[PDB]
């Protein structure tokens, strides 16, 4: 067999410090967090609010911080892609916890259906970016494939805002075809 997959993920980033309240509950667990945003100009920052789930954040001794931080955007998109190729759904169905370990469990669940990695390609979409072969060797050792089967690249977009996104496609092939 041959199978193809697609994944998508996006994270606002990037390791900010949140000043969260108990949110607003009016019906007939969510928080409301304020932080110093980052604009494309380094020495300039901006106040901004946002709702986050107490699970997506981690406190410190209110005062919280995003859980993902940091990259780990491509691992998620690539994960979904590898799962989708094998018809196994979304990341949330995995259970175990590190962004890199989620991918490793995804590939373990893919060779459990009889597929090795044929070819993987990832597209990173950013605003103002380098160390790509580094990220490319980590995907290769996690997928038990050669570095020449993994490709990563970044395209850019040069008033002010932030955000980082990624798409990934994966091709799977049935393993054990050395007959």
């Amino acid at each position, epitope marked *: 067999l041959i199978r193809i997959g697609h994944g998508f993920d996006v994270h606002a980033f990037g390791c900010v410090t949140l000043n969260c309240s108990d949110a607003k509950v009016n019906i007939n667990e969510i928080k409301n967090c304020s932080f*110093n945003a980052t604009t494309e100009l380094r020495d300039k920052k901006k106040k901004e609010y946002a709702l986050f789930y107490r699970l997506d954040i981690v406190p410190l001794n209110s005062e919280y911080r995003l859980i993902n931080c940091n990259g780990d955007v491509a691992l998620h998109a690539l994960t979904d892609a590898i799962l989708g190729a094998a018809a196994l759904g979304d990341i949330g169905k995995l259970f175990p916890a590190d962004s890199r370990g989620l991918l490793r469990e995804a590939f373990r669940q893919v060779q459990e259906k009889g597929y090795k990695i044929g070819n993987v390609d990832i597209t990173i979409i950013a605003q103002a970016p380098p160390h790509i072969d580094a990220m490319r060797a980590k995907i290769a050792e996690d997928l038990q494939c050669d570095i020449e089967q993994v490709n990563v690249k970044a395209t850019t977009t040069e008033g002010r805002q932030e955000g980082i996104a990624c798409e990934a496609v994966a091709l799977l092939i049935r393993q054990g075809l050395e007959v």
Partner: antibody
Framework: EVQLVESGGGVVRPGGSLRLSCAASGFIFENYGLTWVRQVPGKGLHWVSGMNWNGGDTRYADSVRGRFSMSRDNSNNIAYLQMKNLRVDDTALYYC??????????????????????????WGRGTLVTVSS | EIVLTQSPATLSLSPGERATLSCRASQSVHPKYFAWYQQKPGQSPRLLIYSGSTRAAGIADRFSGGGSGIHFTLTITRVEPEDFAVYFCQQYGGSPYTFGQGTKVELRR
């Protein structure tokens, strides 16, 4: 037309207590700092206190520290001034003035929406406080 | 902790001519952490200068601020009738922030 309005001023006897209130309108209250200023009619201005957008940087004058206390409730656009142990000297007119909508640290970086209490552009009417037995 | 003393106490001038006010500081103040105000009888102050020399909204270019360290001056070039008031200086480079005692620019006759 942005506006600030003080209220609650009146009479109080030495060693008494009194609480002033400043009510804002026409602008994003949560972005700006705040300050209080006292002034005797005919004589000059004197800084009382000042705070930043959330209240985490509150300071007072040498004559007022540990005696007055200043806070704010951003939810309803209002700030207060808690006064205790009133000497007769504290008799004056108490203004409420608005700070900035930005702030800078010792590295030179600019934080918009994180106002402070440096210079003041919007001044209130002024409420009178008389401390006399 | 930082006290500001401005001179003269009163500066009697006739419309048209120059007015130079001085504000001396006890210790050094950053040249861009200074401010000035104007106040007429029975009104609240209005901001003229902040960040040492940048004018406020509605303030024409006859008002001109500046200085550094211990010497700060405000100068009006062509005094006009609407300009006769009392002028306070304020430093905010070190807590507690503080005002001056006030220079009165009156009309000479």
């Amino acid at each position: 037309e942005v506006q600030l309005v003080e209220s609650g001023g009146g009479v109080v006897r030495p060693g008494g207590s009194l609480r002033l209130s400043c009510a804002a309108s026409g602008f994003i209250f949560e972005n700006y700092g705040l300050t209080w200023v006292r002034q005797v009619p005919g004589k000059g201005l004197h800084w009382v206190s000042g705070m930043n957008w959330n209240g985490g940087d509150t300071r007072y004058a040498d004559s007022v520290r540990g005696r007055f206390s200043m806070s704010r409730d951003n939810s309803n656009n209002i700030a207060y001034l808690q006064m205790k142990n009133l000497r007769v000297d504290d008799t004056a007119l108490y203004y409420c003035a608005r700070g900035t909508d930005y702030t800078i640290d010792d590295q030179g970086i600019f934080y918009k929406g994180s106002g402070t209490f440096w210079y003041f552009d919007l001044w209130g009417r002024g409420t009178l406080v008389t401390v006399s037995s | 902790e930082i006290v500001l003393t401005q001179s003269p106490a009163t500066l009697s001038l006739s419309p048209g001519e120059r007015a130079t006010l001085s504000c001396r500081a006890s210790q050094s103040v950053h040249p861009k952490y200074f401010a000035w105000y104007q106040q007429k009888p029975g009104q609240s102050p209005r901001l003229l200068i902040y960040s040492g020399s940048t004018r406020a909204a509605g303030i024409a270019d006859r008002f001109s601020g500046g200085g550094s360290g211990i010497h700060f001056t405000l100068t009006i070039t062509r005094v006009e009738p609407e300009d006769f008031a009392v002028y306070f200086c304020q430093q905010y480079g070190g807590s507690p922030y503080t005002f001056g005692q006030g220079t009165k620019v009156e009309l000479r006759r």
